[PDB]
Design a protein around this ligand. Structure first.
Ligand code: HEM
Ligand code: HEM
Ligand SMILES: [Fe+3]
Ligand SMILES: [Fe+3]
Ligand SMILES: [Fe+3]
Ligand SMILES: [Fe+3]
Ligand SMILES: [Fe+3]
Ligand SMILES: [Fe+3]
Lengths: 154, 158, 158, 154, 153, 154, 158
């Protein structure tokens, strides 16, 4: 379907943007020595890459052309709290779009795409839970304690 | 073997206490997992499973004494807004159940129910040396480490 | 991730149902162990652990959606006097839970909250294929085998 | 020969009907909780499908067209004694057809298919003995005891 | 009862798919196409497992599975014909399954719905495999495709 | 200096474009059933991601901000030979830019960067030779035989 | 094979720098161990071992070039009175070593000593990605975590 393919292309554009932002954030975290947070950000990046792989295979299933050219605005922070808040922000703003896309897929009687997007939604919502938890942990234990935990093993 | 109405009644009260503690520990562990305090969450989940085992022991003893367990009744729950209030409430409930278990043990001794007394003494030993002890240690650590450092230790590896 | 109040309310209702199911399964398993039906006791211990896991999933979902998980509330219990009454009560309660789950799934789909819909579909599948199916099988087996043969099979090794 | 191929197609139709009947009976035995009888019916089904595989390969190797389209009347029992009785009756029809087909294949000096059908007839006669014995056990030990044995582990 | 009838129709198609896939695999092994025959044997086995799951689901719904009926078998005389026949049968499968899933969603029946949704996932995977196989036949030539389908001699 | 960071960012944009192009080509190759060629392309895409990882490390170490937003034009092929030509051409252009970057790094006495870019050049010319010889293989063995090899095991 | 006098002189300067760095890292590691900063002590010990390895490589190159190493020569030592000063001094010395290494690599390239250039490029990579990078990370973490938290991390388990 044309509308379903366009919506999947928009979701894929989100996925590529998230991959780039996650990997950049992980790289500057490693640069600053936050090994634990860098490792987790790298893992979330890789998971986003696998999800984008699934989406591209799904788009090619629907005889469409995946769009790997468009990328959304990259929210890169100057410090760890800004990275966490930017990542959570993009996850939420794209979670709304993913929900709308799942509704559209249900409308068009596209149920394999709906299943794939529901799995993507479950992973995305776990990510928002993790990032909201990280922001609240920064609020609770303090900035310095959270940074010390992010460093992990010196 | 017939069980007296008084022994079965105090056993039912203890079972109600254990079930209410299990529900409170359930909610507390789930909100601790929600807040990202993984270490405290695992500990509280283990304590809740211990409370489930205690309730099972109590139900088996009550059914041995030819009595119907009182599983539906629940005491008032005291859910804490944050970790210090969480664990103050946990310690308060544990001390309440400690006093209840001591009264039940005294009554069991006064009534020649020595096997029930043994089971209740095992329950009191577990409660005092595992549940109460850890909770008092946690309050002391909240006072000493400070709230921020204690929450850092509770969060563990992120 | 603030969810709709309707989704939170129906999830709290499902949580109340699930906790009541856990309590009923606990009592039934304990009295089956008391009577010497160890096979049924093992199956219902497994089922009660499953219901506790379901209640944990529900509580985690309600806490994720910034809702307060109500656990103090319980529904009226239906404790069976004998094994056929155990099976009938468990089957009826699980069927009512299935009806509530289907209503909640429909509502969650309506409010476009699809992750909760996936969780509730998982819960409904577990309730239908594992719990409701086994209880229907047990009722049919009590009918066909007869009460004495079924109770002999439930006893297992004496 | 044309008659040998027609007889092989008839035996294949009998085997496919037996496959469907046995698998359905196994599934409703498992639905009712008769785990042991359901497992035996499932194994009997699987053996009939392996036999149909052998028969299909034989029909193809004779440069013939296997008729997997046709299927006989499924006798589906309302309860376990009726299931066993229906299975035995279908095996009766299949065994008579097998004996006639073996005689025909012997007449046309087509011996490889005759040997394959001899194997099929040995298995069919074993199935006759099993189902006759099961019905006799039902009569001897009571329906309730037989159903308890069919349940096995609760 | 409508959900039961739809499930019975899906089961009838799945039985027809079992028969067609198995007969095609046996013909491919008769001709010597071992790799293609093995793949079609695996596809038939997966459809047998799918029919097993659907019969379990129908019996759980206190319905009577209709294993007597069978759809028409599209039997091909050469490998490309059997490829396109499998593809057409899978397209009919997909349309019927989508209608069934919409019906199951409408009737507030969700467990048979997720069963049908996973069935639709495998069905779409098979549809892609057969369309790709046909396009590959066109791309490399029938001779090269048959050489690959033979596998080891 | 700003010139070395600009050159490294240009090479990084080349790397990201190569990553996206290789992943798209692998996705469509396995969409068409080219399992062997698709696997090789996916592996090359993974290697390009590892290279971009190293490049982001080096840019961050040099007190710079990697540009993961900007991307080059994707030469998506309509069939396998067109994919080979597009990949070879973009590798040739990237190799020319890489040689210029290596020269600039040597000029600025930036030797660790020169070592990293020399590794990149070695891998890039390996890829360039591979695609050149694959095009010559398409010529030598024909299009249909090359497609049969690219599919691999059925 | 005979080497250039300029190559030998810059190699001797690099060797003097590397020996001084090894001695400074030795004292720093031992004063960190004395202060109980176990993980910092282990890291600085490993860095000192790497410095001895690099000095050995330089001496092998110098002897291969038929020169005479200057191991008696030692540069001034900048020893820090506390961990931040120790990290800053180590970073400054490694930066000076980086500049000297870059100058020596340029000289080797001009003098057509490509094997020596390869050795010095490997040394520069080790100094930039292992030593300078880690020290800059440490100063950043001192400023981000704070001195107290950084010293707690440096102490490790006690
Ligand atoms: C009509 C409904 C059928 C159903 C529900 C069904 C179901 C099954 C199942 C559940 C398996 C088990 C596979 C495994 O666990 O690995 C199986 C295997 C098999 N089926 Fe079917 N089947 C059907 C029809 C057929 C037919 C008509 C044939 C051949 C003419 C056939 C041939 C086979 C063979 C050869 C196997 C492999 C046996 C083995 O691996 O031991 N099936 N089937
Ligand atoms: C744009 C910059 C990207 C970078 C820097 C990057 C980086 C990486 C790295 C370092 C790995 C691990 C390689 C290894 O462990 O050997 C990886 C794996 C992977 N990447 Fe990328 N990636 C990027 C983009 C993408 C995109 C856009 C996709 C898909 C659309 C993708 C798909 C994958 C997949 C499927 C894996 C395999 C993961 C696994 O199976 O464990 N990557 N990536
Ligand atoms: Fe307790
Ligand atoms: Fe449940
Ligand atoms: Fe008996
Ligand atoms: Fe060829
Ligand atoms: Fe060095
Ligand atoms: Fe601290």
């Amino acid at each position: 379907n044309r509308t379903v393919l366009a919506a999947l292309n928009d979701v894929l554009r989100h996925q590529l943007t998230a991959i780039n932002q996650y990997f950049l954030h992980a790289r500057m975290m490693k640069n600053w020595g936050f090994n634990a947070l860098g490792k987790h950000e790298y893992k979330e990046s890789i998971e986003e890459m696998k999800a984008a792989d699934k989406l591209i295979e799904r788009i090619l299933l629907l005889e469409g052309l995946p769009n790997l050219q468009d990328l959304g605005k990259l929210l890169i922070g100057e410090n760890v709290p800004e990275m966490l808040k930017n990542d959570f922000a993009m996850e939420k703003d794209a979670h709304a779009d993913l929900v709308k896309t799942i509704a559209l897929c249900e409308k068009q009687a596209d149920y394999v795409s709906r299943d794939l997007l529901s799995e993507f939604l479950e992973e995305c919502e776990e990510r928002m839970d993790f990032y909201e938890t990280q922001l609240e942990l920064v609020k609770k234990m303090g900035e310095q304690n959270y940074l010390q935990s992010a460093v992990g093993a010196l | 073997p017939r069980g007296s109405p008084k022994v079965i009644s105090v056993l039912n009260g203890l079972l109600t206490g254990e079930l209410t503690a299990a529900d409170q520990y359930f909610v507390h562990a789930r909100m601790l997992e929600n807040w990202g305090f993984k270490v405290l969450y695992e500990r509280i989940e283990h304590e809740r499973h211990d409370e489930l085992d205690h309730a099972g022991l109590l139900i088996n003893r009550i059914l041995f004494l030819e009595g119907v367990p009182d599983v539906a009744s629940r005491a008032a729950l005291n859910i804490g807004s944050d970790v210090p209030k969480m664990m103050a409430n946990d310690l308060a409930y544990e001390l309440q159940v400690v006093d209840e278990l001591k009264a039940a043990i005294a009554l069991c001794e006064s009534e020649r129910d020595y096997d029930t007394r043994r089971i209740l003494v095992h329950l009191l030993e577990e409660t005092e040396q595992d549940h109460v002890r850890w909770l008092e240690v946690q309050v002391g650590l909240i006072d000493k480490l400070g709230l921020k450092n204690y929450l850092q230790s509770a969060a563990g590896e992120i």
